[PDB]
């Protein structure tokens, strides 16, 4: 029984690989020789935020491009006003171990979680005038790796269970659960159309899931080691990924294959975070050697480097308007560039 | 007109800042420990006599200690272990040998010792289930470790009075195996603190306190460039 099924799976995989090669007209580099390079990018630190006591592990820009959430392993969830570098809120968490945080698009709720296996969501706009726990979601049997807000009522989550789930905030129950990963699901990213979301896991594979049907639509296996970060190209037809193998890869859903791979011999470190600028021409990634490299999304050349940190860059993000780039690092400092 | 909102935000910033400063003293006044070990180990009894993550809080000589035990997690540990890169020490608990579970414990200790993170974090090693070790030795280890035949008792050994020499030889052979992993790999950035303990042992808290003070003292020496 098992042997026949495995043989069938191998045959299906061989067909998929054959189809993938049949669509390999040319590399993204080859078609992009006609496009001028970005040149040197010299982003410099504009603001420095202090107050976190331990290493930071996640940040998320709000829809207004001003409010920043920052979850640290010290058990605090501080909200920053990037314009005036003055803290707006500081929520004390029930568990000091936090791995992810997010800001609701409406700006009313903030979610977070970690090793506790419980996703905690706090209502900033409260009648009492103080932060409070709107609801706690439980059911994951592993550490909550990433969580993002679809809207004011739905939140999607990923954990170390090798599965993802969609939570309806009102009932506090899993509307649907996504399964098929073999390793820990580390990072998540919602598509711009809020219709699909792509997941990276600790198995050198990335899966594209659809929110409504609750099924995976595409699998990408171009990486070598565990995937740490994942982000969607602004137009929604492509997504970038990062792994410990020291390579950043750009995948296209329509093509279903790795369009481009970013790598340099001098880099032996893994990628911690990844995000795209508003135009998508720049791919910003964080690396273990206390710096972030800006990669030409088309020419695959290092435009510049952000080397203002003294420790690992754990989280990275850009505003919806693309005015500035915020990066969090384990030295408890948030740096805003340009 | 715009000064009213600046004043309100400034007041909020000061209110938040005061709370953060008050919490900073508490956070810096607490020593965080990660209790790691296999299921068969005596860690459950250790916490008893002293959500996916369990917490045990205790004080020795009026100093706060915070010990974290991760129970509700999958076998893979290479990711969530990364969060413990700032703990004062790792309380590693090992059983005595059932199959050769000691080799698995040694491999786990090797991975903890050699990871890029936790490389600066010292490990406090507890060789638990000592009574069972004495019972089995008095009543086979060479089968799981052929090197035991050529091994001899250390010249600096300080066994308890009335102990069987074979028990002491088995004691230090396991300790030396772990110490070889600690010494043959890594550098002087961190050290291993071996201790022999059992379920009924009130000295465990004192041993942890002594190890933590030594680790913090060494850290201060490094900050001052004396080490």
């Amino acid at each position, epitope marked *: 029984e098992l042997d026949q099924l*495995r043989q069938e799976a191998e045959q299906l*995989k061989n067909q998929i*690989r054959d189809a993938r090669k049949a669509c390999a007209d040319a590399t993204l580099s080859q078609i992009t020789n006609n496009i001028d390079p970005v040149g040197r990018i010299q982003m410099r630190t504009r603001r420095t935020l202090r107050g976190h006591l331990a290493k930071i592990y996640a940040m998320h820009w709000g829809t207004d491009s001003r409010l920043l959430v920052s979850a640290s392993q010290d058990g605090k969830l501080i909200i920053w006003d990037s314009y005036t570098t003055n803290k707006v809120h500081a929520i004390p968490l029930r568990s000091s171990w936090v791995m992810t945080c997010a800001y609701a698009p409406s700006g009313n709720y903030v979610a977070c979680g970690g090793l506790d296996n419980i996703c905690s969501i706090y209502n900033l706009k409260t009648r009492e005038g103080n932060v409070r726990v709107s609801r706690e979601l439980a059911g994951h049997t592993g550490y909550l790796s990433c969580c993002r807000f679809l809207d004011d009522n739905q939140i999607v989550t990923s954990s170390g269970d*090798t599965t993802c789930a969609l939570w309806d905030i009102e009932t506090g129950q899993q509307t649907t659960t996504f399964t098929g990963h*073999t*390793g820990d699901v580390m990072s998540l990213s919602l598509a711009p159309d809020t219709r699909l979301f792509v997941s990276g896991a*600790c*198995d*050198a594979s990335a899966k594209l899931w659809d929110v409504r049907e609750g099924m995976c639509r595409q699998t990408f*296996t171009g990486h*070598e*080691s*565990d995937i740490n970060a994942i982000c969607f190209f602004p137009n929604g037809n492509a997504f970038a990924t990062g792994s*410990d*193998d*020291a390579t950043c890869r750009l995948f296209d859903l329509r093509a279903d294959q790795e369009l481009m791979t970013y790598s340099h011999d001098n880099i*032996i470190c*893994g990628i911690t975070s990844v995000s795209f600028s508003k135009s998508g021409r720049l791919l910003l990634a964080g690396y273990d050697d206390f710096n972030c490299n800006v990669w030409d999304a088309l020419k695959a050349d290092r435009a510049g480097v952000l080397a203002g940190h003294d420790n690992r860059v754990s989280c990275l993000g850009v505003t919806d308007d693309g005015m500035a780039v915020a990066t969090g690092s384990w030295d408890s400092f948030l740096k805003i560039w340009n | 007109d715009q000064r009213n909102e600046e004043k309100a935000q400034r007041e909020a910033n000061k209110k938040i800042e005061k709370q953060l400063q008050k919490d900073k003293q508490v956070y810096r006044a607490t020593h965080r420990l990660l209790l790691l070990g296999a299921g068969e180990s005596g860690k459950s009894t250790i916490v008893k006599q002293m959500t996916g993550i369990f917490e045990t809080k205790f004080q020795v000589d009026k100093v706060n200690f915070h010990m974290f035990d991760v129970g509700g997690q*999958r*076998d*893979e*540990r*290479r990711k969530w*272990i990364q969060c413990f890169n700032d703990v004062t020490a790792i309380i590693f608990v090992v059983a005595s040998s059932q*199959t*050769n579970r000691l*080799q*698995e414990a040694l*491999n*786990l200790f*090797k*991975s903890i010792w*050699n*990871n*890029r993170w936790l490389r600066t974090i010292s490990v406090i090693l507890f060789l638990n289930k000592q009574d069972l070790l004495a019972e089995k030795v008095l009543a086979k280890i060479e*089968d*799981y*470790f*052929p*090197e035991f035949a050529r091994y001899t008792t250390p010249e600096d050994a300080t066994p308890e009075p009335g102990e069987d020499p074979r028990v002491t030889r088995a004691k230090y052979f396991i300790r030396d195996e772990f110490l070889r992993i600690s010494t043959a*790999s890594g550098d002087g950035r961190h050290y291993c603190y071996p201790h022999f303990t059992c379920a009924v042992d009130t000295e465990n808290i004192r041993r942890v306190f002594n190890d933590c003070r030594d680790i913090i003292q060494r850290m201060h020496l490094r900050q001052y460039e004396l080490l």
Partner: nanobody
Amino acid sequence: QVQLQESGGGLVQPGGSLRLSCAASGFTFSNYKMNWVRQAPGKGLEWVSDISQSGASISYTGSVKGRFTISRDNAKNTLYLQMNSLKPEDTAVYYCARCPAPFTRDCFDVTSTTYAYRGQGTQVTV
């Protein structure tokens, strides 16, 4: 796609000899450390032996010292394990496991269940 497949196995007379090898694909073999894991019936996964990138460092278990020999061929992208003096306790399914990350010595989760970088394995009987 990253894949590992083993070769060899089958019944072996007590005190006999056998050879197992694992062929790699989808990753740079030279930049990763490799290990062998066996799972005896009714028992959990057991680490067998390991070899570094350059092959200058090697280790085995107490029950395996002197009996088994591990080697690697970076050019052929294959893993090696020479077996002799087999015994009944050696019967198990042998898996070709790969370290999670390159350029690092730690190999945390090779022995864990439902691992992502190990092959289907091959049966060995004595």
